[PDB]
Structure to design on (1244 residues):
């Protein structure tokens, strides 16, 4: 325990929250109406310790889509059900250079955090059963990770993502061409499942619980239940540490030093190993595609509380 | 006229033909049954001068698919009907480096000789009318270029190419994503038209007449009719000179110095400006994807007859 | 403390040591005689806890050159004397893609762990004074980090490295061309200083103490003295975590999860934050350029003692 | 003969000259004082037919440095004295992609038209003799190519190029590292010889005669003497056609279709096979590094006189 008095730590979270709030830069994603809708002023931070202690400030109950924030989670599920060796016969274990190919030196997506990786990972989960069944499987899993808190679905986002993801289809066919999917995979059906997963909704509060589960070696801080295998958690964290922030991953690993994962909805799934889970959210993104207020908050948190991986 | 006595020149063609015949290396394309079918021993050479003088040796009447050999032709048609400026707002004018992106520094395919280029070019031809109509349009055009000689269609090849071109679909969606097609293009419909064009059949004899048309500033050596605009012909030749032989383009431009275009069927559309048209054919391809006997023949022809662009 | 009974932990180190010993693969660097000299059978492991507790097994007193192992150290010194902001105006903070340019998107070496980076970093240290003086400065520093244990110099290696580093000169001139050095830098003089630094000698024992200093927030476990600033230590560790193992950095960060740095001499500077410092050594390197026995040992250590950054 | 009445053709040259004269854009190279010196208003065009017929307009007698214009020439000399096979064991035969490596897929410079290529080519010429002797050898050669017209040397340029070519040194050491030079080459001595060659001076008039020699299968139009082997001339032309205009090579080959070679001094060595040699000169260069007035003139010449390789 680095937070001796949670109650006082909470007071610092609010101060940091207020500080980041003053950062108004960035543009709200608008490649689809469902994301343009959001007000740039929404800003919420939710903490959930390994204990089970909670704390929120800002718009922490407004539902938003996980988007790329779901990548770490579905990867954790795959490693959990199939183990490191199998999962990684299809996807890499490290950051790529940056233009921006699809496959690496072995015709495998560089890692589970980039789109091609997430797509392949999606094709490994619950093979055999139909999409509908696969979807409930993952939903059930996400609920355990969130200790049964809010986990919804945005059909509007799903539909917009599907009838607009031309690049995800390009990736889909390319991977199919390079034989990157398991024998007998319905490629188009996987892209569909992929769009659905990106459309799952959460709130800063429910997500913080999911982060805390990863922060707690796979045990839900608020139910005590074992959701993910130790193996799965460690893998997910390692990859979030190196590829969770898009093109900002390097800077983030160097300056913040914490496993995190951003999403185009403006969310940032943050994890402080053996301490707490967190979810920052604010629609305005920067050139890198990360939440402006979120990035700011993270830097402040590590400076103030010295949570950096190497202190 | 560099061939004072055609009759004697013909005797040299046969000698070269016989020489190349001894080259048995290479593997016959087999990504689809329609190409695997072919016997590695088929070998045919057909000449057609600017005059109209013909000459054949070897299997010059066995129908085979143009495949990539159609690229120069459909490009010539586009420039003919739309002019250099318009056509090139969508496709580049030079060789790429070699891994192997899809678009260039301006989000345009590097040139009409690579798949992404050919696909975009296909989307420019006869816009408005339906596929069936577009197809007849091109067929009519190919007939004029061949002075009405053999020009067929392989439905079997078309079907195999379609239900197997995963990479061409990847390219299709990527180009659609990057807005590379003209406003209101039915991308999937274009890929269909593209597969059809690759399935058009010809014989060394009919093709040599098409080459001769390009060799004759756009006039069919055997009908005297103007098929392509001077502008269109010159453009096509320039691009065949630099991007007609896949990864062998550089070596070919340096050692042979003649506008040419190979295809996976084993054909090599050759052009000796203001002299003659030619079509070499032999199913066995080398690592580069060019006909082994064809490449050999070309080198011998330029050494013997000093036809190199810079003699 | 994760090692409750050091005495028993020591017994496990020996078991791991013995296990790795059975790995005879790899080739001993031979681009210069000074490295070819070494026997592939040399193998030594030395531990030094944050306490000051020591333990060695194998050839832990045979002097060998730090080579690339010096990179983390001279970087730590620069950040210590100049701070993060200044140092990083000249060198990057993350892994590159892999062919293998010299500069990044901003005309700066990608990071201090690659040759171009180390060279620039070398040009920042103790500017003003002459080489001889600069060298003693660093030597004095290395001694404090090693609690005054063995720190020598191989003039033979230095001479061979100098009269043979054509690629380091290429890098030198390229950086000078791109204005990557501080105003008024004697480029050739820096390369000289660089070759000298690579020729500094240590033993598994003295090096383990240096690693322990980094493992101890900058305090020499055996003298209690503050050698490096907290800022400097954290930076060095972050970069060792992501770029310390050449092309194996990704795999290493994923499977081992510990700050490390290899060298062509066969050494591997290992660090277990807040626990211990370590130095593995065995001349036979693998294709990646890392010590075969060393890599093996590291994997075994993390599996056995669960020292991975995310357990 | 495409120019039936030279006298009238001359009248068109002057019209084109006057037209290009109105193009004032571009910046005069200034990386060294010797080039900054030049007035942006200097503009000269000199023709020299295969006959021996001359014609000049503009500043055709003001001496300027060949710079990269010497590349085609020293390559022609190497092929002449060593033949295609030998020369090309060290240098490639085609355009590279564009960032901008030094070697190709076989550790050889891409072609003789890029700096790394020119440097290697320089190391092949007159091996054995000392620099001074090598220099006279080439000078003697250049004189024969120019029918003994003006061929000087700028020691000022040489000195500035030498004490400033940090990138050429980077290239020098890199090539030495990759073993790209013939056994026993004094790398630094070659770079010296290289800087000297770039400093050779000519005038539009003397250069046009050199171009005409290449345009005349290796025979000096004004002395009738055989200066270069047919083999050498054809090779040089092929490479000028594809790599003579820096990053504009593709556009130039497509729109102009003529063997050319630009230089940072603002000169453009142009060749119309079997017709004439030409040298355009105007210090203001564009972003690509080619003479603005020169590029303009070339486009106009090919449109007007239909000299394009494929008309
Ligand atoms: N420029 C381009 N970037 N990515 C593309 C396909 C990745 C191959 S094209
Ligand atoms: N290695 C790869 N090559 N091409 C791909 C897409 C081109 C972008 S991935
Ligand atoms: N292939 C090559 N790799 N690196 C070189 C220089 C890096 C620029 S050439
Ligand atoms: N960005 C860079 N370009 N060229 C360099 C060396 C070529 C290798 S670094």
């Amino acid at each position: 325990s680095m937070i001796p008095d949670f109650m006082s730590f909470t007071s610092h979270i609010d101060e940091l929250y207020e500080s980041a709030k003053k950062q108004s830069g960035g543009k709200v994603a608008d490649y689809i109406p469902q994301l343009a809708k959001f007000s740039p002023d929404l800003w919420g931070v939710s903490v959930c310790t390994v204990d089970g202690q909670r704390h929120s400030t800002g718009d922490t109950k407004v539902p938003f889509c996980l988007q790329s924030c779901v990548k770490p989670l579905k990867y954790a599920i795959a490693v959990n059900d199939l183990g490191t060796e199998y999962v990684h016969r299809y996807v890499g274990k490290e950051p790529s250079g940056l233009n921006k190919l699809f496959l690496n030196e072995d015709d495998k997506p560089h890692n589970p955090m980039v789109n091609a990786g997430a797509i392949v990972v999606t094709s490994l989960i619950k093979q055999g059963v139909n999409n509908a069944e696969k979807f409930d499987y993952v939903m059930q899993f996400l609920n355990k990770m969130a200790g049964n808190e809010y986990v919804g679905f945005s059909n509007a986002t799903f539909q917009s993502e599907r009838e607009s993801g031309d690049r995800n289809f390009a990736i889909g066919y390319y991977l199919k061409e390079k034989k990157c999917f398991p024998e007998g995979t319905d490629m188009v059906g996987i892209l569909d499942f992929y769009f659905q997963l990106c459309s799952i909704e959460v709130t800063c509060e429910s997500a913080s619980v999911m982060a805390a589960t990863l922060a707690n070696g796979g045990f839900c801080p608020i139910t005590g239940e074992r959701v993910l295998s130790p193996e799965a958690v460690r893998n997910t964290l390692s990859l979030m540490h190196s590829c969770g922030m898009y093109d900002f991953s390097g800077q983030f690993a160097f300056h913040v030093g914490l496993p995190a994962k951003s999403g185009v909805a403006g969310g940032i799934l943050l994890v402080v190993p053996n301490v707490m889970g967190m979810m920052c959210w604010s629609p305005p993104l920067d050139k890198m595609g990360n939440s402006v207020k979120g990035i700011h908050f993270c830097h402040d948190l590590v400076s103030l509380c010295n949570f950096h991986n190497y202190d």
Remarks:
- Chain C touches chain D through twelve residues (CB under 8 Å).
- Residues 1-311 of chain C form a domain with the Beta-lactamase fold (CATH 3.40.710.10).
- Chain C has one domain: 1-311.
- The radius of gyration of chain C is 18 Å.
